[PDB]
């Protein structure tokens, strides 16, 4: 027919139950209370499996000692004895680990593409009729990617631990919320007050759920119109630069002292009537813009609103993009849900669904939308899926209808102002000591805060376990210090640290086990580029080799508090300067090492292979 | 805005019990949840330590709990998990009662001026004006806020890998008896495979409590009355496994070859935590129910005398039988059954089947707002003083019936095998849940100046006599000092022990027939105990009744709760052990302390 999108139900809008078409129809996960209850239980189980509340409580004392041993300046120390800082560290540490792992997988994908750029260029140029999903399969096969599936089922199987979204209610379980002092400036009373968070922080955690996008999701929008390998890589980096900036904003909302809003769906109080209408309000915690979607009958309308600069009277800010008239004053039952996709991903499907509003049934429109928001499940309709990915690229590209850099900058300024206002208000009410406990000024942004990233190692070379940490990219400029903590069963041990650059690596041998040891100090300019031994670099790789290891931690610290920001890179900025990461794969064997091998040595000195012994 | 009808089928409630995959999917996530928090490998490890602590309590002869015997260990695993989950819910109820009392003026305004809105909306409003830790009344939100302890106990996973068939023939050797004690009889194995505990959150109870409440005092009384009934039923559930009988299994009967226009459904609920059962029949658009007693049953019939009637139900219907485990109490199931009967004309047959099955199997409230209001109104009526069911009479009769079964089974086994074999397979010590000497492992998420705070709530007691409380503390460091704080209305008592890896008695209390104790000259219904330990690894609290099978206190009702009011506002305050001095230990009333510093006396 004329329509490219064909509804599973015909023009009669009736599908017989028990038939194949009805079996493959999408389900309303948000609207169905059985479906919503099941999704929440599985999500909580996944979080509790990887992150154990009983384990995090036990490791509190060990982490507190390490943070003090960093010898930070006054006003920049992180005190984990305070309950508020410990809760913020728990959320931040898991947030940064997930972002770190996604960045690591992106670098491997970039290296794989560059190794087979001739075959990749042929696929992109010759084949344009196939969909985005089919193009991703061919690319992920031509390159020897570890994960070769873009299907949601294959992604979940190969997702692995460490990238599981954080579940706020699990983190906030069992923490004291109400403590009174009643005008008692005493050491015992102040110690008691430091043990409890306030109600505002409890409400923030109950409405928090992080979103982390795998590189196998990003590849489909990246290759939808890409014609060359450079365009594909440039699109991949542009999307992840936007994602990382939004992820930073998400953590900053917990630091400032206000309650974050919760996404909800409004549906009519009376079920099974003629009149059918639904209103979705999405408040992405990891973003600066929101979405309001209204479906009355077969008509779909949307409005993109700013999450900043809003008075207390109205939750919605100014409208930055309009797609119709949406009434948010509709009366009905309110069902709260947690979005699992970014604002751009939600917006991309809304534009695609509006185009095919009359070509799909209402149940298909609702089921496809709710499955994406609540499960990150892409629509099974291939034609609908392809249009969504085309809109996702447009929302990210330079021709985007939304100026993302302007809105992200405004969100940062608005959040900083709110922190100052809330700190001054509580200072007058209670005092400086109480205000500092509840609103710590040391945390600020996610990549500005001093944070630790526990490392997991599955590779053992001659009895030495390799722990890999990727240094950079940096969204801030200043001076950065890196430290490593090594816990080993043996009483005396020798461990090695290696930093890989574009031309050569630096080998370090250390012996101190439990106290943190500084490994690398760097200076980064306003372009997010550091000068590592005469060569400009955008990121570095740090590998720790430890024998009979139990735990390895890496601490990131900025010299100054509230480090100034670096403008987010776009597609034009990424294609301008190209850095080679093919050297991040090579390893060394600490067992076969000599005194002459330690230090900074360029590749020319080594042979082919044998990156341990410096004899050519 | 007229729909094409596809959306309304997607929000249509589903037959979870009848559909096999839905019933397969729910068993799997309930098993996963139980194994997530209670690990069989961990529990088998701590068997040796628990056995030593139980032996170190120095119990009198005939009251010792020997965890070396397989039967006693299995019953301890069920009892400790059941008692723990009930303890957190009681702690949460006490916290909620405190918050309501601080905001009585605001709560009173809501109750008077919000009669029009739904029960769920009123509960959400009440939980907002108070600074409640959990502010969600939806089922999805309650699951997220639920902790580790409150997870229901999955019976089949507990009784996995335990040896059942051990045969020693006419042998009285010590070696043979040791092998005999390592196994359990087949009867206990069937008991665990049909056991699933139900623990109701305080947030679910606030909707029945606030549906007709007009004052804050009435709302608190309604909450306490429901949990008095709920806790009583949990005791009966544990005693059912203690006796030598096999508990019945809930089941659903469906036609062998169902027809499109002439289908029928029959539901039989056998709540393990309760004294009454429910039979619900759905023939066409007609709904009928019968409430039957679970006690006094003869061998021929699995149903006792019916105590409440709602029509005629035919339990002799022929068809396929599907077994399932309920997630709601008998009172909760009955409330929906009465509500569904009234709305039978206005509801489709698919809605009748779907709404009922989702509530019993998943504890999911119906999406219909009118149906939700009527159920919570009926829930209040069934738990009030004007309830059609005399719960106190049926709870007491179940207690008497269960005691007679234990004597009959023990005497029957004594004749067949002997006294030694009978004691192994039917331990007489365990008796009721609150009677039994049990331990409650404590979790601590609060640290004050390096000291982790572990909180335990003494009482409320359903039994009277003399009760002893002991605490075991395990720490990594050697030569530590730990403190115990017992908080009451008048003041708190501070104790320093500095002994690890062994039980240490901290309190001895006497409870009278009204379930109240005299703590330093004042009547207390409950007390709060806080243990402060530095670098702690495990803190365990034991409770012990001086005599076996302590007599039961009559279950309190609504009028009993409003007659006497006790203040629990002082349970929140704590001390800083690092700043303690020698003069600070002992019993000290608040008048002595300065405002906000309860560690150091003026």
């Amino acid at each position: 027919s004329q329509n490219s999108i064909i509804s599973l139900t015909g023009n009669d809008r009736t599908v017989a139950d028990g038939t194949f078409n009805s079996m493959i129809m999408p389900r309303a996960v948000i609207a169905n209370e059985r479906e919503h209850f099941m999704k929440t239980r599985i999500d909580k189980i996944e979080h509790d499996l990887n992150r154990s509340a009983k384990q995090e409580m036990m490791d509190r004392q060990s982490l507190a000692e390490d943070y003090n041993a960093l010898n930070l300046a006054v006003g920049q120390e992180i005190k984990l004895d305070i309950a508020t800082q410990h809760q913020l560290n728990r959320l931040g540490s898991a947030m940064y680990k997930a972002d770190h792992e996604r960045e690591t997988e992106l670098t491997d994908l970039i290296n794989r593409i560059r190794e087979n750029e001739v075959t990749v260029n042929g696929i992109l140029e010759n084949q344009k009729a196939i969909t985005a999903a089919e193009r991703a399969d061919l690319l992920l096969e031509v390159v020897a990617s570890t994960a070769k599936s873009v299907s949601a089922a294959g992604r979940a199987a190969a997702d692995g631990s460490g990238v599981v979204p954080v579940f706020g209610p699990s983190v906030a379980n069992g923490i004291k919320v109400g403590i009174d002092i009643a005008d008692s400036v005493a050491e015992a009373a102040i110690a008691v007050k430091e043990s409890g968070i306030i109600t505002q922080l409890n409400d923030v955690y109950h409405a928090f759920q992080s979103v982390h996008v795998a590189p196998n999701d990003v590849i489909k929008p990246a290759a939808v119109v890409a014609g060359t390998s450079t365009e594909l890589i440039g699109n991949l980096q542009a999307i992840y630069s936007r994602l990382r900036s939004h992820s930073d904003i998400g953590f900053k909302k917990a630091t400032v002292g206000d309650v974050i809003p919760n996404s909800y769906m409004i549906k009519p109080v009376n079920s099974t009537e003629y009149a059918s209408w639904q209103l979705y309000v999405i408040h992405p915690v990891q973003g600066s813009l929101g979405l309001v979607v209204q479906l009355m009958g077969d008509a779909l309308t949307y409005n993109v609103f700013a999450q900043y600069g809003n008075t207390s009277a109205s939750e919605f800010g100014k409208t930055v993009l309009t797609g119709g008239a949406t009434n948010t004053a509709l009366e009905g039952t309110k069902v709260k849900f947690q979005t699992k996709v970014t604002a751009q991903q939600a917006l991309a499907l809304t534009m695609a669904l509006k185009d095919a509003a009359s070509m799909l049934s209402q149940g298909e429109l609702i089921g496809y939308f709710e499955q994406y928001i609540n499960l990150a499940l892409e629509p099974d309709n291939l034609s609908l899926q392809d249009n969504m990915h085309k809109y996702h690229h447009l929302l990210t590209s330079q021709n985007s209808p939304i100026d993302w850099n302007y809105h992200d900058e405004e969100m940062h300024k608005w959040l900083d102002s709110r922190k100052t206002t809330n700190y001054d208000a509580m200072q007058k009410k209670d005092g400086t000591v109480i205000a500092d406990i509840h609103i710590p000024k040391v945390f600020n942004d996610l990549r500005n805060t001093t944070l630790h990233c526990k490392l997991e190692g599955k590779q053992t070379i001659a009895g030495y376990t390799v722990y890999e940490y990727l240094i950079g990219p940096w969204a801030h400029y200043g001076d950065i210090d890196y430290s490593v903590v090594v816990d080993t069963l043996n009483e005396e041990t020798k461990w090695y640290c290696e930093v890989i650059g574009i031309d050569g690596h630096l080998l370090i041998e250390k012996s101190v086990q439990h106290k943190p040891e500084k490994i690398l100090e760097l200076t980064v300019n306003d372009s997010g580029v550091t000068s590592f031994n005469g060569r400009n670099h955008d990121r570095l790789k740090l590998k720790v080799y430890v024998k009979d290891s139990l735990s390895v931690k890496v601490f990131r610290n900025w010299i100054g508090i509230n480090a100034p920001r670096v403008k987010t890179k776009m597609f034009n900025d990424h294609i301008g300067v190209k850095y080679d990461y093919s050297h991040f794969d090579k390893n060394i064997s600490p067992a076969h090492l000599t005194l002459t091998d330690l230090g900074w040595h360029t590749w020319d000195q080594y042979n082919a292979g044998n990156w341990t012994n410096i004899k050519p | 805005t007229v729909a094409d009808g596809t959306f309304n089928s997607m929000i249509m409630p589903r037959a979870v019990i009848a559909n096999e995959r839905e019933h397969f999917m729910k068993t799997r996530i309930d098993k996963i949840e139980h194994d997530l928090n209670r690990s069989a490998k961990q529990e088998m490890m701590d068997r040796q330590s628990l056995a030593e602590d139980y032996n170190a309590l120095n119990l009198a002869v005939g009251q010792e709990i020997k965890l070396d015997i397989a039967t006693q260990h299995q019953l301890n695993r069920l009892g400790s998990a059941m008692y723990k989950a009930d303890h957190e819910r009681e702690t949460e109820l006490t916290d909620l009662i405190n918050r309501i009392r601080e905001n009585e003026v605001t709560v009173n305004g809501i109750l008077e001026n919000q009669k029009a809105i739904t029960a769920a909306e009123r509960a959400d409003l009440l939980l907002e004006v108070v600074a409640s830790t959990a502010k969600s009344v939806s089922a999805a939100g309650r699951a997220a806020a639920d902790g580790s302890g409150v997870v229901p106990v999955f019976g089949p996973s507990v009784a996995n890998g335990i040896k059942v068939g051990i045969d020693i023939a006419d042998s009285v050797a010590e070696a043979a008896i040791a092998v005999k004690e390592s196994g359990i009889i087949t009867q206990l194995n069937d008991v665990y495979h049909a056991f699933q505990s139900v623990h109701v959150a305080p947030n679910d109870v606030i909707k029945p409590a606030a549906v007709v409440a007009g004052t804050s005092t009435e709302l608190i009384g309604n909450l306490q009355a429901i949990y008095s009934r709920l806790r009583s039923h949990s005791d009966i559930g544990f005693k059912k496994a203690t006796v030598g009988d096999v508990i019945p299994n809930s089941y659903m009967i469906k036609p062998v070859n169902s027809t499109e226009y002439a289908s029928w459904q029959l539901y039989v609920i056998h709540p393990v935590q309760g004294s009454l059962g429910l039979v619900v029949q759905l023939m066409g658009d007609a709904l009928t129910y019968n409430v039957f007693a679970q006690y006094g049953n003869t061998s021929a019939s699995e149903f006792g005398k019916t105590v409440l009637t709602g029509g005629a139900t035919n339990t002799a219907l022929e068809g396929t039988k599907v077994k399932f485990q309920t997630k709601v109490t008998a009172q909760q199931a009955l409330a929906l059954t009465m509500a569904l009967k009234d709305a039978a004309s206005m509801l489709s047959q698919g809605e009748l089947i779907g709404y009922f099955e989702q509530y019993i199997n998943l504890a999911l409230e119906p999406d219909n707002l009118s149906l939700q209001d009527n159920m919570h109104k009926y829930h209040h009526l069934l738990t009030s003083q004007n309830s059609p069911i005399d719960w106190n009479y049926h709870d007491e009769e179940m207690h008497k019936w269960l005691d007679s079964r234990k004597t009959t089974n023990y005497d029957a086994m004594q004749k067949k095998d002997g006294t030694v074999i009978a004691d192994i397979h039917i331990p007489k010590v365990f008796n009721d849940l609150r009677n039994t000497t049990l331990h409650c492992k404590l979790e601590g998420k609060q640290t004050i100046a390096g000291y982790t705070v572990y909180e335990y709530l003494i009482g409320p007691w359903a039994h009277y006599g003399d009760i002893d409380y002991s605490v075991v503390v395990d720490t990594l460091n050697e030569e530590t000092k730990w403190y115990c704080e017992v908080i009451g209305i008048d003041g708190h008592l501070l104790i320093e022990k500095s002994v690890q890896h062994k039980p240490e008695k901290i309190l001895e209390l006497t409870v009278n027939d009204s379930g109240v104790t005299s703590f330093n000259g004042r009547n207390h219904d409950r007390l709060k105990l806080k243990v402060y330990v530095k670098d702690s690894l495990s803190v365990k609290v034991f409770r012990n009744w001086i005599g076996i099978n302590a007599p039961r206190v009559k279950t309190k009702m609504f009028n009993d709760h409003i007659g006497v009011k006790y203040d629990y506002s002082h349970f929140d305050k704590n001390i800083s052990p690092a700043h303690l001095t020698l003069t600070d230990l002992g019993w000290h009333t608040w008048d002595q302390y300065n405002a906000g510093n309860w560690t150091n006396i003026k």
Partner: peptide, 14 residues
């Protein structure tokens, strides 16, 4: 083993 437990155990051993 947690880092807190390992450090405490090592101190006990020495």
């Amino acid at each position: 083993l947690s880092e807190t437990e390992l450090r405490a155990l090592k101190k006990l051993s020495t």
